[model samples]
Target: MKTGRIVKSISGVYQVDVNGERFNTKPRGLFRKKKFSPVVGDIVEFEVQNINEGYIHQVFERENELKRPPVSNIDTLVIVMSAVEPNFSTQLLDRFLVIAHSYQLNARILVTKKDKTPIEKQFEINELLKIYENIGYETEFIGNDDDRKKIVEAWPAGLIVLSGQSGVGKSTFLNHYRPELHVELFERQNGYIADTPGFSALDFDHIDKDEIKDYFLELNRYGETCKFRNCNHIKEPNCNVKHQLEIGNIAQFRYDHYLQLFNEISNRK
Candidate 1:
């Protein structure tokens, strides 16, 4: 038996990579009965049943998993945004951050094409970046190609997922991050980084209404001080989160988005 990482899954077969060789493998019948499907980026133990065919016997524990692109063991989620083109949106950034927080994964914001943004809008984006930075997210403005090396060096060696709205330069950044790689997946340090091959879509269907606040960094902090226990921080007197919003401690845009998501979640039930 040998251990390998599943780099791709197509139909019923998985492309497992060990050292530098590739193996086409399938999970044992036991896995299918147990509803244990191996995803890309999963470290699996397999036995070579034939030349390039193998049986995956085990799957290692995952650090984190994303639902849309269906990858596992992600350590850092790099949320790429553009300053112009589709425009920089705090709403989307906050949504991505909330999703990352819910999964216990580290999140970083990469704002690109600042040079192409109008002078007025650049200031707006910078101001929004300050809000996220104040909430303890690592963020940067990528002015050009020269800053690529610095960004790659800043990443800790682990499984990183690059995600963002379409046309926001997620693929462009991945190319710069690893120019030599021919596949969507690549290794760095001792970990993997890959571009999520779908639009960044967040569905909070699994998240309870009460659980939403915990995913918002600032809201969670302020929620603890609310006079009511387990406060949802909406329309409650002596609510610290609301107070913060009133006093500009929390950005109005963020609080509004929180309310919107809260309503969206509540309406689902």
Candidate 2:
């Protein structure tokens, strides 16, 4: 038996990549009987019946997984935002941030359409991006070929997923840096990236109200110092998070998002 990673799953068949050679594989009957299935990015042990045929017998552990796209073992999520056309907003960006934090995945923000953005607007956008940068997230503006190269060069090893709004140049970004992404398999430097059309807003169905603060980096930091051990940072006296908001340390919009999401989860429960 040899080990390989599943690169694609269509219907009941899986495409496993073994030493750069693609093999068509199917899950063993035992796996199907267990009601378990393999997703893209799953490392599996398989028995080769022929040069191009195999049967996956076992699936290894996953570092992370996304139910929507059905991808596993992702290392980072590259969120692309457009400064023109659809326009950029922190609210939309924060929606993705919530997903990243929930999955414990690192996030990288890339602002596109910079060339079409006004100089003054670009300055404002840069200022806004610095807030995330200060909180330990990497942000970049991709307007030209050089910027695109820099963005791809900064990608770390492991699986990366590119997500953003539909009209935000996500396809263009992939086409420019990695056109092969549309072909059989796109691999680079021992890492992989999948180009997704876009991501819609995530609901708070899976997020608990009490644990919402953990998804917001700034709030989570201040929450550790709050007076009560179980403080939710809402209407609590001497709350460090509230104090930070009062002192302009935390952006008001971000706090608004927290409250909105918190309330949504609370009302559901």
Candidate 3:
């Protein structure tokens, strides 16, 4: 019997981080009968089935659930994500990137637990980080236990909110890694910005198709002179988006995410 926090959940499986030892788990049948779905930041009591396996049987009551984003008991919940311990989700990051786009924020991808990544997957991770660099996002690599002073020194002032998936170490990073920084931010200015009770909640219902390209810089850049004046990129012939894709100027996964979101925005109406 072990109790831990559910740091990440996707497709019903949860990533439970219990004292740095990661556990991959799913809820038991009992939990499925009700609409009581689990979300990140949940403290759950689970049993080890055995990367690690387990089955969560109980989720401790949350402090308060937001009207949106199922996360609760969050002390100024900022988004963060995993690299390997539980698993990385580029799709989730893409979802975040698009939301940051709507807010006119220059999003950065700060990957955690790089120090724990196996040698076999290093190259793959490097290339993935480079893809984001090419896409104009400032990609950062740091271990979960990286230098605290340096991270604080490099932090951008003016309401720096950490954003990523669960298991990325938001609570741990703040609660354990560096709590003083939060106080400094608190003192940065009198009520200029408080560490408000916030968590990730993204929606594209307000976004229109025509405005998406501006957020996806590469698509807008290559579409500068696409054969068709209005090359929807998906169905148009001689589209530079596809041409660049074939020539390796564009990343397959990023482009794939773009197509997905494009369709989402297109289908919204």
Candidate 4:
């Protein structure tokens, strides 16, 4: 058997790249028993029966995996948001940032729809981006690039998971990046964007509290200034996290996002 990198996975079959030759393959053992299904970006060993058929015998270790789109070994999770139309907000950006941090993958922000954004919100938007950029994150603005050749050019050769809300030009951006990939587009004058089902939804059940901690590292560091040793930062007395948010040390939108997520988890139980 020879090895190949799984490029795409639809249901039980996989599109693998072996020796620069892409072929579809079916899985062999253990994967079926434990439900350890193969995912895109997984380095796997397979045997080619013909140009159209192949069997996957083994799957290698994955560096990172995401529930939505079920991609594995992702090098980066690109969170694309916009400043207009479906306007980008701090809460939305934080949710995505937290999700990326949870997976331990490199996080990037693409602020799209900038061309249509009003001048009034331009400064505010830059300030919001500054907070994320301050905490060692890569953030950029992509107005109306017909294609993302330059953006993709900046990326190293590795698996990339493009994710965001349901309608934010995610699929169109992907199609632009890789024309060979067949992706549908929505018809709308103001750039209607949509994603396939199970594309960007978070699997909260599989995520642990500590995993959540990874995303709140910035807030947690600020948490030390609170009155209590174990402050939860949810409307508590003398909470440093909230204090930072009040002083703009931490972005209010990102702070509000923390409370929203805290309430979400609380409500889940």
Name the best candidate (by TM-score).
2
Error of 3 at 74 (Å): 20
**What is candidate 3's lDDT per residue for 81-111, written digit by digit as tens?**
6778767777877777676665555556777
The regions of model 2 sitting more than 4 angstroms off are 145-150, 176-185, 267-269
Model 2: pairs clashing at backbone N, Cα or C within 3 Å: none
- Candidates 2 and 4: which is better by TM-score? 2
lDDT of 4 by residue, 1-269 (tens): 77867766766778776644668888888755547778766789887797667888888978887655566666666787878878777777777677677777787787877767787787778877888887777888766743565565565455556677756756656555333452121212222122232235545555655345447768878877889777777757988887777776776666667767866754554
Give, for candidate 2, the lowest lDDT window spanning 10 residues: 177-186
Report lDDT (CA) for all predictions: 0.78, 0.78, 0.65, 0.67
Per-residue lDDT of candidate 2, residues 135-249 (tens digit):
6788988686545645675688767778777878777656754544421235655566675532565545677787778888999988888999888888888799999999998
Each candidate's TM vs. the true structure? 0.84, 0.89, 0.60, 0.77
**Alpha carbon RMSD to native, model 4:** 5.8
Off by over 4 Å in 4: 32-34, 48-53, 145-147, 177-202, 205-211, 221-248
Ranking by TM-score: 2, 1, 4, 3
CA-RMSD of model 1: 3.1
Q: Quote model 3's TM-score.
A: 0.60
Clashes of 3: 4
Q: Write the per-residue lDDT of candidate 1 for residues 1-269, one digit (tens) a residue.
A: 88977777887688887875789998985655636788887888999977888988888887777667778777778888888888788888777777777777788888988778887887888888899888888888886654675676678776778777788877766775464561245655556678564225545666777888988899998888899988888878889999888889999898888888888877734
User: What TM-score would you give candidate 2 relative to the actual structure?
Assistant: 0.89
